[PDB]
Each structure stands twice: as structure tokens, then as C-alpha cells.
Design an enzyme around this catalytic site. Sequence first.
Site, PDB file in Angstrom:
ATOM      1  N   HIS A 144       0.876  -1.175   0.000  1.00 25.85           N
ATOM      2  CA  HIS A 144       0.000   0.000   0.000  1.00 25.85           C
ATOM      3  C   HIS A 144       0.916   1.228   0.000  1.00 25.85           C
ATOM      4  O   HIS A 144       0.535   2.310   0.437  1.00 25.85           O
ATOM      5  CB  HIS A 144      -0.871   0.018   1.251  1.00 25.85           C
ATOM      6  CG  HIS A 144      -1.585  -1.270   1.507  1.00 25.85           C
ATOM      7  ND1 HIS A 144      -2.607  -1.728   0.704  1.00 25.85           N
ATOM      8  CD2 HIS A 144      -1.452  -2.181   2.500  1.00 25.85           C
ATOM      9  CE1 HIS A 144      -3.076  -2.862   1.194  1.00 25.85           C
ATOM     10  NE2 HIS A 144      -2.393  -3.159   2.284  1.00 25.85           N
ATOM     11  N   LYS A 271      18.357  17.905 -10.136  1.00 22.85           N
ATOM     12  CA  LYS A 271      17.116  17.205 -10.447  1.00 22.85           C
ATOM     13  C   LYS A 271      17.228  16.359 -11.719  1.00 22.85           C
ATOM     14  O   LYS A 271      17.680  16.834 -12.762  1.00 22.85           O
ATOM     15  CB  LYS A 271      15.973  18.209 -10.615  1.00 22.85           C
ATOM     16  CG  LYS A 271      14.656  17.582 -11.082  1.00 22.85           C
ATOM     17  CD  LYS A 271      13.577  18.631 -11.389  1.00 22.85           C
ATOM     18  CE  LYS A 271      13.856  19.384 -12.691  1.00 22.85           C
ATOM     19  NZ  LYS A 271      12.802  20.394 -12.994  1.00 22.85           N
ATOM     20  N   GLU A 278       9.443   6.348 -17.745  1.00 21.80           N
ATOM     21  CA  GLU A 278       8.074   6.742 -18.041  1.00 21.80           C
ATOM     22  C   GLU A 278       7.742   6.306 -19.450  1.00 21.80           C
ATOM     23  O   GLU A 278       6.638   5.877 -19.741  1.00 21.80           O
ATOM     24  CB  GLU A 278       7.915   8.245 -17.870  1.00 21.80           C
ATOM     25  CG  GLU A 278       7.999   8.665 -16.411  1.00 21.80           C
ATOM     26  CD  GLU A 278       8.039  10.178 -16.223  1.00 21.80           C
ATOM     27  OE1 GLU A 278       7.991  10.622 -15.059  1.00 21.80           O
ATOM     28  OE2 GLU A 278       8.120  10.927 -17.219  1.00 21.80           O
TER      29      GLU A 278
END
Lengths: 449, 448, 450, 450
Positions: A144, A271, A278
Site C-alpha cells: 500500500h 534534479k 516513463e
Amino acid sequence: TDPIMEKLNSSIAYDQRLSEVDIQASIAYAKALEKAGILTKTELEKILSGLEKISEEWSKGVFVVKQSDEDIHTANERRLKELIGDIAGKLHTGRSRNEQVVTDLKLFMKNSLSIISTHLLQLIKTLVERAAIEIDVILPGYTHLQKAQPIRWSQFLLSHAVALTRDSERLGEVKKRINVLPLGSGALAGNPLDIDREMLRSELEFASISLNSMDAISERDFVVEFLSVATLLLIHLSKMAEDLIIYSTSEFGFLTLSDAFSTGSSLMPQKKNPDSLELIRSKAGRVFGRLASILMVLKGLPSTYNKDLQEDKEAVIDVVDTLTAVLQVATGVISTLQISKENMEKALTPEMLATDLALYLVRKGMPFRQAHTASGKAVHLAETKGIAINNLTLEDLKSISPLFSSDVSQVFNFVNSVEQYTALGGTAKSSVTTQIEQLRELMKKQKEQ
Amino acid sequence: TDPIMEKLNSSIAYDQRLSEVDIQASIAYAKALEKAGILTKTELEKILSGLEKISEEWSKGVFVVKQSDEDIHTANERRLKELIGDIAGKLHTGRSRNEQVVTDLKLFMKNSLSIISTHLLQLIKTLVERAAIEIDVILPGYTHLQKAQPIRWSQFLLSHAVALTRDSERLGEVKKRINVLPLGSGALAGNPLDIDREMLRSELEFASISLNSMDAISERDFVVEFLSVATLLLIHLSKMAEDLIIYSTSEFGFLTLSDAFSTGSSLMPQKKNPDSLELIRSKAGRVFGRLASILMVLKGLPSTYNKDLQEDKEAVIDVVDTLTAVLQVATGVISTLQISKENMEKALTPEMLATDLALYLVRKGMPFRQAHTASGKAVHLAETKGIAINNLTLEDLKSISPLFSSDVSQVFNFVNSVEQYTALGGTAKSSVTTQIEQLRELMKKQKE
Amino acid sequence: TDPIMEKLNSSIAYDQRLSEVDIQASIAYAKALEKAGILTKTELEKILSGLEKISEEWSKGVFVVKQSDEDIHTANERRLKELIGDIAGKLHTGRSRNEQVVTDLKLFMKNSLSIISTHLLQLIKTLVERAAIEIDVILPGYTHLQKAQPIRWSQFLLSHAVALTRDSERLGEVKKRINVLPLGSGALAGNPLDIDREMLRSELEFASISLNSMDAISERDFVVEFLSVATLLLIHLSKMAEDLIIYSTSEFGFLTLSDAFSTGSSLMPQKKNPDSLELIRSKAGRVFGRLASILMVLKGLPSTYNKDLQEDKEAVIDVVDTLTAVLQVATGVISTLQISKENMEKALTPEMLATDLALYLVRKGMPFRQAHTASGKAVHLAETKGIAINNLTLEDLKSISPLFSSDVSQVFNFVNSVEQYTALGGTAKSSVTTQIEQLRELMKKQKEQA
Amino acid sequence: TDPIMEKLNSSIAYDQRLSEVDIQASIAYAKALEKAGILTKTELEKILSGLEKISEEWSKGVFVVKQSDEDIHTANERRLKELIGDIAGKLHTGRSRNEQVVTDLKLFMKNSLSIISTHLLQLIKTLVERAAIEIDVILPGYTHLQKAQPIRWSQFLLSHAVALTRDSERLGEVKKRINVLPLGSGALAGNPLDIDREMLRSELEFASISLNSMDAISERDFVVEFLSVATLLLIHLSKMAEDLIIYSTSEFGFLTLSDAFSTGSSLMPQKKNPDSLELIRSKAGRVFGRLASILMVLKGLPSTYNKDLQEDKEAVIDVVDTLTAVLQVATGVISTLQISKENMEKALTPEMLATDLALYLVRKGMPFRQAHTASGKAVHLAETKGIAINNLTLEDLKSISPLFSSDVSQVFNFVNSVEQYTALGGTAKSSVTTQIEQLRELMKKQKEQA
């Protein structure tokens, strides 16, 4: 014939990918035609050189496709005629475009599956090696998306390798049925000239020949299952994609993709965006899409051959190129990503050993429900005292249950937590090593083809 | 604890089908717990004795579910506890619901699969057997739903049998990956009590044990495979249903279904509608749906367990029942349908032998292109004379090519036509027989 | 008929859900049979009294079903006869079950969609209002799941309210085509006794009547688009779920679900599993499947009626109860979740402002490319001195470009950062306030569309 | 930097279709950029001069590409820089490639939808007009692919036209949501320079502007909706293709397609293969695949932008082109196909009029059951005397019910059969005429608002 119709019916654009296999299929057929007495020893020699020349034109990317070329088959037939004369026409004796289609596509699929196998195994190999080298690293196991219990960073990697290995077995299973020759099936009733299909089998190197001409021409089971297996394998990658992306955030900080598989801006030089992952997660949709389309094309179709069937080619070619690209990009990501042993180590918290503390009581003869309750208090008593669970007092614990002893201190060690799972398949170190062995023995067999 | 939220978790409505398998798994675990020292030989005695009565209760339909039972697991958990006391609690030691879910489903699937297999091999056997008996019948072979060439009705039946034969093969394969024990995986890291998984394997009758606890709690590959193989099976049946539906129209008139599998009306006694075949054709969509849903469910989920996985159950159970019903209906339709040898035969026209007229010339030496042209000129010439090409005069054919001899007559014969296809796999008699032999040998390797 | 074939036809289990609408349809038809002359006023009264009686038996929950009932239309047909005998037979005069099916299904969908909309507007409301209250909260905005330019929490909330609002519009559109009366199409050629279709329309409250009997009997567009729009709506929720689930991770610490919509244990009582949200995400698959099945069922089927069409019933009801429950649970979660302004703020970092620094030089005239380079040098030198960008010197800054002034000191402020987006649609407070007005209006209009 | 990785981004191969619209999106942002102050009136003219040139190089096929240009945007920028210098850079001020892709896709869809809509209406007009001309043709209508009862050829054609009509309406609804401008959303928080979004809308010609930047950047509803609508449309076609294929069999012998839309061989000149209808039916799957694919891609994605969204472009372009050809091929098939009145008529049998014979009694006051039973006896009697029911004698029929009168001879006429269905939507001639007018009216409306 209407222009908009012949355009919608066109396939030369993408089925050029079958050029080489179309030739090989004609070469074999020509040879068998000679045996049947349809071609003479001389004509056959003229047809092979012709066909081989056509083969070179394509390979060199110099073949000239013309307006008239509806498909790769007609294209190749036109060329042979231009090159050797009307003698090339004898090649289509008894043949039918219907059987060429399935023959070429299967040939193309066999070759394709060979490559997809290679990359698929390299991905697995890559995950297993990394699991071997980083067997000590420990981090949170999630359920979860919540921290559940410690696990070895390796158990995580191996869970993916295991799933991908079942994908390798399924691919192997598909390959066997694709490896069955449909040539010599005619338009639908069979070859009318007693062609030597056995000979055809070994020229094209197929494992065996199709059992029934009507089925051989109208079935696209091989496309469907290749697509189905392709889809499930992409589902596994989409799962791994999700994991790494989340693990690669700044919030989690468990790992960072390499420059080659990420994007970023000079304004935020630290970053890194996981584009590669993706891109791969999305391909699951792309592949499922193709699977659904063909399942829909086949449903309710009467026998035998129908033009609807033509939709298979493109779907098969796209998915082949999709897997090839995606497996390789996956291998790279897994190979070059950088983990932060420090962050994974920090993610391990005292709270996560409440389960372990309960088991400690269970080992000393305390019943499941009571030990659970017992650990429950320790966790609560810790909140009150405003301190972490591993820093409670043996005196404190004993107020909870006499069964706590000096030896309770070992519970608050993460290595001890994982080593609890020695039972096969668990996350204990021997079990991780056992898995790495099993997977290697598995890949040796699957490759032994 | 939210009213509607609870409604969504309730599964007890459909998962009681796992009542018996859930009990068997708990029984196997208890035994292992004794072997590990978690339970005393005595305790074990009392745990099984109880579990047994929960089983017998379900089998006899006597088990009684309460409004608090939110799913089959909780139901047995509550029934055992109220049958043997607090002792029931030790049974859950080191065990996770995450692992009961997959263990039970894999057991349920294993079992359902034997049943499916038996029904599938029956269908296949019915087609093959019928192909054996009606082997002399001949009718049109279609492409684009236009009469292409003469074929044997048996070739038509065997083509379907072959396709289903592959379905049977895939099933067996799925079966091997399902026949792997997931018990002892914990909630994700494994069993923390060094449980003997080999013992559990033997007790439950699985072929082997799952290799990775994380993978075993989170994968539903076994479901996706079953649904995929199932969809393809149904696809095959949706194709057969279409052929028989069209063949049974009054327009085609090749066959008629029995009253048991058709509907009609008193105003039109001879009219028969094939809704058995229609139901079947539609189930292809139903099965496909379940496949699409689980795929969609798995895509993008992170490791390891996630509530989303709970959707598998209902989908598997439906598909299993749909398959079991559809196959049996298929078998019945095939064995009791009545074919019209006469109409299938009147359907063969000489216009379908033009291809044969050309092969004739090809067999006499003429190269294909010129043979095709010659046959075409003969076809055309007939239109001119307003007659069938089988009614052309030898002088008329020689008019087109000297190559035509008086024997060309042998061409306009539909038996001679199908008998050209001797190459393995064709519609020729020897070849059909061979397919029948090959299929019988496969059905045998299938049972095994 | 074969036994297994009978199981395959048995639909009584799930289609009892159409009991009421089936009775309403019979009443309508019945009354129209009187007007047509097929029934006498007397007979109508006796049949209506029977039908009405059956209605109550279902509504009271005391209707007894027989193992003889294969479907709901049969159960009623029989039960009416048990009540009034032979006269019941005349009710089926000129009527086809083929038309009973779609009529009953379109009625059920209409009633249902009316329920669903209620819940959807309520979910959208919840988001919108909460958005207004928490209009001051500011947290990270993500692309690639990596921090981009900071945004307002309300902006986030509203992005979901907007998408959901398009779902509401699509439902309204499906409601219209569903609201066309098919009753009076017969088996496929239309009603043979010249029944007053318009009269049936009025009685059943349909907006208008079907144009072609064959189309009415064989089409299932209304089922397909309904599953279609529901699937898109679920997609939106599956996305919102993914967001909250991740935001609820201790790693993110942005929010936590109430106990009512979560799960956890006593060992780690401070942790909560987003069960609610996960169920909902999983339901997108479930609904999508139903969509897929009906699409495959209908592909390549011949005109006009075929038994295949029977697969629509179950799918529709399933998707209806899923939507009904999912939306309610979705409202509960959004309604009771507790956020952490403390953490959403912390997540906000100086590095996230290099963009603003570059824009700053754009406002002062510098072109984009050169300003991008400028800001680049800036965050770079900030690294060298091993300090956060916000602490560079006006001189350090001036060394890069003379265009730097002392007002650049405002650049390093989050509120200012978000307030840059005043253009409509942006995260600036006024732009957010505007959206809240627009949503309230849209909901007004949609609410008043029923 | 990885080579394989770069082949997975190279969208140039197909996104060139956004060339012209991409340029328009920029010509509009520039103009808006000037107003904002970021550009000078001289700069604007300069930039626009380039774009306006780039637009030509594509609309003439000269725009040379480069194995450096991954996507159409990068391609278009490259050529602008080469045409005007470093001034081009300013065109990207405050703009985000995230908004360029949605802007370009919607614009391309708005254009495509308009072309598609034209073909759709042409198809519909072709079916409604042919229905008028051939309104007297009568053939059997089928259920379970079995003969049920006589209907007018036109009733069949119109049923398909009616289903396609609803597609036309759905497409129209989808176009209104695609006609909403997302330009000015930035990377996810909005445009940071206060750009005038109303100016953009007006320039590009959208109806309204996006409400929330995060949603406007991440939602792909317009792709899903369009895909759903296009799938239902294709289903309709798959059904029409099935009927026509079946009716074209030599077994049915109802019609024949032209050579232009069929296949065959000199060996069997009369045999015609409906390749055209088969290609069409198969596209239902292909288009459905695209819909499945995008639904999976969006399911479970977190807010806001994610690289995954890049799978939309190809699916859309593929469906746009598939829809365009398929619709034209259909129009050509219907319009050039030949029917066989003779065979359609030979198919009508007396057995099919037992139903009418029952309605004959009903209209004279007999109850359904008794009348049905009565018709059953006439049928059995006919079997007995071994003749068709139209041959039964008046004395014969009397022997069954005294209600039969000599005028019963009019039951046995097929025109009379279809004429019974006068109720709105039925197959009677007056109804078929009402339908034709109703459709002509709809096309008008849907054509005006397009």
C-alpha cells in the site's frame, strides 16, 4: 479500383520489413517446385540468382518500390520478372498470397523472437548480477506504498527478475507454435501439386508442418499469443518502472538514474527526470492496445480467409520494435542507476520492528494474539515515554511481559530482522543466494535452444 | 469503518467458491505449524477436527454466513474460533492474508482447469469423430464468404479441432505455472518462522514452491495467462459459432441444430434460430473483458501488495464458469446438429473448377500464366455461349488450346477436385484421415 | 432445451433490479392498448391493479421467485397471471420482448444516472469548497514526479474538480440519448397495431421517441457510451488516487487519510494504508473491462436482433453500482483527509526558484536565452560557495549581469513565486478564486439539468 | 544520450502533421508576446516573417529535416533560428513545450474533425437518399440471422443511417471540448508573464480557454473521447459491413458490389470479393486498440505532466486517417452497389405471413392467444393439405374461425404486410418517408453547427 480504396488496402509501407523473409520463402518454394517437376534444373538456377539479387537490393537499401506495388509480395514478384523474364511467373504455380502472408510473418517472428530473447535474458542477467553484488543493502519493503518490514534490496531486484523469467518461458512456448510451417497450404484447400512440404520444412528450418490447410490459413493464434505474452512482459516492466520512479524521487531518495536515461535542467542541475522509465511504462498501453485490436479483428470472423486478417502485420512489427527498444533501455537503466546505500539505510526505522518484537514473544511460547497485543503495548508505552521502541528498558518491557529478556536487544537490528526469513523464497541471505542460483540454472536451460 | 467503503470490500458474495480450498490450505499450514513447534500435537488435533467440520458444513450447504463475514477467509476464521475456542488464534501465526488469497485462487484454478480440460477434450473428440464419419461429404470452401474451392466437410471440422487442440496445449502450460505453491511467503518478505515449504508443497499437491516472496504476493501472471488463453479459446468458438450460424440459415441450408440448442415458433415450425451458438459467440466478449480488466489493474502498480489486486477473484471465477458452460454447449451442438448432404453438394458449382481446369494444363506442361489465361478464355467463352464451362465441347476447348485432350472431362468432378490435395494438410481423403490419426495421438498426449 | 443452455439463459439473479421499471413499462403499454381498442376500460383496470400489486411485492421485498423464472420479464408475466388469470395475456398483444429489454434498460439507466449525477456533483463540490478554505496552502508542483515550480494546494484540488466537471457534462450528454423511448418498435418492424407511441412516451416520461424500429431493437450505443464515459471518469479518479496515495506516504508526509477510509495495525498505529483510494484505482480496470466486452459483443453482428445482445444487462448494472459506491467513497476521502501545511511548506526549496530568477531578468528586458544562461551561472556559483541560491550577493549577482537590482530579493519568496501566475488558469490566488466561481456556476447549470 | 533511448523520442516521423498548426500556435504566442512587452513591434514583424516562411516550406514539401530534430517543434524552431537569428529565442519566453503539444494536437483535431464530419454526413446523405429512391423494394428482415418478417429495403438502410447520425452528434459534442485553448498554461502552473489568453483564443479561433493549468497540461480527455466516439462509429460500420457481406453472398444473392470495391479473378468473373467491407470491419479492432492503449496509458498516472502522455499523438493521427478513408470507402460502396429486386422479392415467403394472419383476427376483436392459436391451425392445415397458407380456402379458414372473411385474402400480400407498421418508426411507407425527412433535417442542423 478506387484510389482511396487501394490506399487503405496498401501495406508496402510497413511490410517491406518482410522483404528478406519473402525471398527465402520463395526460394524454398522454387526448389520444391523443381522437385515436383514444375521447374527444370535450369529454370530453378535462373530463379535463385534472380531472387538472391532481389535480396541484395533490399539489404543494401537500394530496392526500388513503385506506385503499383500493393504489398511486399507483389513488389518482389514484379522485380523478379523485370530481372529474369516471364520465367519468374512459374514460381507462383499452386501458390497463394494467403499462405505467403502467414509464412513470411511467422518467419519474421521466429527471427524477431530470437533477438527479443537475447535482450530479455540480458535484462534478467543484469538484475541478478546487481542482486549478487548488493546483497547486503537493506531498505523498506512496501505494501500500500507504506513501510511494512525490512527486506534486502536484492530480494526486491530478484522479485522482478523472477517475473521476467516467467516471461522468457512464455516467449519460448510461443516460439514453438510459431515454428510450424504453413507453406504448402494453398489458398485454403492445400497445395494442389503434391508439393514436398517436408522439404519445405527443412529449407526454411521450421520445427514441423501445419496440420490443416484451412486452419493454417485463417488462424492468427501466433499473433494473439505473441501479443498477449508481449503485453504481460510490458506489465512487469511497467511495475518496475513505477517502483524506480517512486524510489528515484527526492522524497524517497533511494536511487538516481544516470544521465543517459534521464532529463534535467541547468536551473536545477541536481534534479533528474526518469524519462526512460516513463517511456517504458507507457509502452504497456501501446502493447496492450495492439493485443486488444487483434483479438477484436478475429472475433466472429467466418472461415476461411478474410481480408480483415491483414491487420496483423503492422501490429506484430510495432510490438517487435517496441520490445527490442524497451528491453535494451531497461537493461541500461538497471545497469547504470546509482543507489544511495545511505538513504535506504536511513529509511529503516524502529517502528518497523514491532512485528519482529511480536515474533520474539511467539518464539518463547506466547500465543499469536497475545504477543501481538504485547508488542502493541511496548509500542504505545514508547509513545508515552516519548522514545523510540529500541530504547525502551528491559525493566519497562518486563512490566509488559516476563518473557522479555536481555536477549531482546537483538530484535532491534535490521540484519537480524531479514535473517528471520530463511524459509525458501524469503529475504534471508541464504534464500537470496539460493534464488540467484535457481535463476541462473533457469536461464542456462531456456537458452539451451 | 465507512458504510459504503465496507460494501466495496465485501467479497463474501462470490468468493464462497473458495470455501473448500481455503480450508484445505489452513489444514496444510496447521500441520506445518506443529512441525515447527508453534502448535502441540494436541492443539493440531483440535485445529483439524474443527477445520474438517467447517468443510463438511460447506459441502453439505449447511454452513451459515453472518452479516459480519466480509469474505470467505473471515468466515472460516470466525467459524473455527467459535468451534474450538481461543486456540484457533495460533493458526494465523506467521501467516498473511496476502498469501491465503493467492494460495486459494491457485488451488481453485488448478481444480477448475481439470474440469475445463475434460470438457475441451470432449469437444475436440466430437469434432474429430464426426469428421471420421462424414468424411465423404463435400461442400464449398469459402474465402471472403464467397465460394472458393470444393472442400470436404471433414476438413472444415478438423480445422476447428486443430485450433482447439492448440487451446488445450496452452491451457496445460498455464497449468504448470499455476501449479506452484505461494504459501509461506508472508505478507511480502517470507515466512518468519522457518516454515517447511516442501511439506506444504506435498500436502497441497503443488509441483514446486514460489521462488521469491515479494513476487509471489504481488503477481497475477497466473490470472492474466488463464484469461488470455481463455479469450483465445472463446475466439476460436466465436468463429465456429459464426460458420454454423451462417450455414444454418435457410439461404445456405447446410445444417440444422437440434431443438435442444435452438429456438423457434409455432407460426413458422421449420424456422430454427441458433441461440446456443449466439450465446457462445457473445461470451467471447465477456471473457475478453475480464482479461482487459486485470491487465488494466496490474499496469503501473508498485511493489509489492496493493489492495487493487483483489479484483482477480471475481474475474477468474466468472471466466471459469463461462468456459465450463460454453464448451459443453459447444459439444452438444456439434454432435446433434443434422447436416444436409444434398444441399452442401448442390452448392458445388462448375464455376469453382476453373482453377482445376488450369492446373490440368499446368500438369500437361503449360506454364502457369498461360494456363490461367487459357482457363480464363474457356470461362469467358462459356458466358458467350450462355452455358456452364463443364458443358463446353472438346472442340470448344481445343479452340482455346490443343493441349486439352478428351480426358479433360475428369476435371469437372468434385471428388477429383478435392482429391488433388494429397500434400500433407490438404483436403484429400488420405490427408484428412492422416489428420484424424494425428489428432487422436495429440488428444492422448493431452490427457497425460 | 438442454440443461446447461438453461443456465446460460438464466438472468433472473441480476435482472430483478429491473423489476420496478419493467412494471412501469407494462402499465404504460397496457394503458396504450386500451386507447388502441385492444383493451376495454374494465380490463385495463384489472390489469393495472395486478401490475400495481406486483410492484409492491418487489418494493416490499416479498416477491417469491420460482425456479421456473429464466428472467425478470417472465417472473412478472407469470405473477400477473397468478393474480388476474387469462386477461393478463392480452397485455402482450403486439409487444416484443426485444423491445421490453431496451425499454426497461433505458429506464433503469435514466433512474440510475440521476443518482450518479447527484453523487458526482457532490464530489466536485467537496473539492471546490475545500479548495477555497485551503486557498493559502502552498506545496510542490510535480512533472515526472520531480519538483517543478511551486503551486497552491487548491490549484491541485481544482485540477481534479475541473476534469470531474467534464465527466459530469459527458454524463448529461449520455442521459439525453438514453432518454429516447424505444417501446413500440415490436420485434423489429415496429408496432403492428398502430399504438400511440407518443402516448407511451408521455406515460414513461421520455424526452422523445426512437426513429427506426430496427435501430431501436438492435443498437446498444447507450450502453457503450455509458460505459465509455464511466471509464473516463474512473480514469480521472485513478489518477487522483495515485496522487493522494503517494502524497500519503511517510516519505512525502503531505497528508493522511481518516481511519474511516484507511487501514493499519496496532504494531504501527501511526501508519495508515490508503485502502479506499486503492480500491477506486482498481475499479478503473473493472469498468474498462465492461466497456471492452460490450464493444466486442457488438462488433460484426448482423441486423437486427441476436441473442448476443443479452450480455449488456449485467455489465450495465455492475458499472452502475461501482460508480455509485466509488464516488461516495471518493467524497468521503477528500472530505476527511487531514493535510500537513507544515510539510507541504518544507518541501518548498530555493532550487525551485531558479526559474523565477531567470524570469526576473526577462521582466527587466533581458531576452530569454541569455537570462536562462544568467540564472544558470547563478545557481552554479551558489554551488561553488556551497550555499543556497537565495543567499548570493547583489554583487555576486551583479557580476553575472549589470541588470540585477536589489529588488531581486523578492524573487526568493514562494508566495511571490505563485503570484506570478495571474493569467487565467494559473495558480495565483485571484486565478484560483476565479476558478472557484466558475466551478460553482458550472455545477449550478448542471444541477439544473435534471 | 543513449542511442536506443533517442529512437524512442524521435516523433518527427509522424508529428510533422502538426507542422502547420504548430506554426499557427507560435504566430499567435508571438503576437501575444508583443502585447505583453517581451517583443517590439519590429521584432514581432521579424519573427512572424520567419514563421510565415517556415509554414510555406512545409506546405510545399521543401522543409528539409535533420537527424538532430527529434520532434516537429524542435524542427520548426531550428528553421526559425536559421531564418532570423538569436531573436527567435525570445519566441519561447514563458512558453512550455508541454502546452505546445496539447495546443497543436487539439488544433489538428479540430481541423480533422471538420473533414471527418464532412465525410460522415456524405455517408449518411448517401444512405438516406438511396433509401428514398428504392423505397418500394421489399425483402425479409432478419433476427438470429433467420427470416422473421417482410420489411422495406429502406427501413434497413435508414437504421444504419440513424446509428451513424448519433455518431455525427457525438463527434459534435467532442469537438466542443477540443475547441478549448490550453495555450497559456506554462509547464503546469500557468503562464508566468501575464500573457493575454483571450488574445490567444481569438487568434487561434478556439471557443474558450482552459480553466486550470495543471489539468490543461495533464488531461488527455480529448484523446479518449475522440477515440471512444470513433470506436462506436466503426462498430456501426462493422455491423453494416457484416449485413452487406452476407447479403452479397451468392447464397443470399441480394446485392452485388462494384468492381471498384471488390476483388475477384478472371477464372471466376462473377464472383466478387467484398474486400472493401472486410477492410472496414477490421478497422473496428484497430481503432479500438488505440482507445484501449490510451486508456491504459493515463490510468494511474500522477499529476501532472509525465512522458507517458507522449503516446497520444500517433494514436490520434492514426485514427484520424483511418476514419477518413473508411468513411469515403463506405460512401462509395453503398452508392455504387447494385441490388437485385427480383431476389429480394423471391425471398419473401408465405410462411412469413402467419404472424399477419394472426393480427388479422386480432384487429377483428379476437384475443392474441386465441388468434395466435388460430393462425397455428391454419399453418398445420396447410401442411396437411400440403400447400402454402395463402392457398388455404375461405371455407378452409372458416373451418378454423368464423371470423375469417373473404377480405382475409389481403393478408397474403407483402406490400400489405409492411404497410401494417404505420406507427412512428415502423417500416410502412409513410413512416419510411417521415424518417427520411427527419434525417434530412438532422443532417442540416449538425451540418450548420460544424
